[PDB]
Amino acid sequence: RLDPPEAEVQIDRLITGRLQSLQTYVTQQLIRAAEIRASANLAATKMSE
Amino acid sequence: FVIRGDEVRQIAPGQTGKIADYNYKLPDDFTGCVIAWNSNNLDSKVGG
């Protein structure tokens, strides 16, 4: 629907939005993985002890 | 080169039109300067 010179602007907007979504998802996953690692360490200690 | 007076604006980078599409296309990331000036009295002929 648009010529390249202007469509680049829209594509850049979409790229920024989707990249931000990915970064948010990855940060959430990192924090959740920290929680799960704490829980798994507790579980391993409970098993051993 | 020499082109129509009203087609000068058609020469800018990332443009559309007969000239840009067919005979002289500038790249979107063109770097440089475009200089134009009427040459009616020096080029146009009384007889055409």
Residue A4 to residue A36: CA distance in whole angstroms: 46
Backbone angles phi, psi at B30, to 5 degrees: -60, 135
Is A35 an 8 Å CB contact of chain B? no
Residue A26 to residue A33: CA distance in whole angstroms: 10
Residue B32 to residue B34: CA distance in whole angstroms: 7
What is the resolution of the experimental data for this entry, in Å? Answer: 3.0
Cβ A43 vs Cβ A35: under 8 Å: no
Chain A residue with minimum CA distance to B14: A5
Please give the method by which this entry was determined. Answer: cryo-EM
* Exposure of A46 in the CB half-sphere (CA atoms within 13 A): 6
Q: What is the identity of the amino acid at A2?
A: L
Is A4 an 8 Å CB contact of chain B? yes
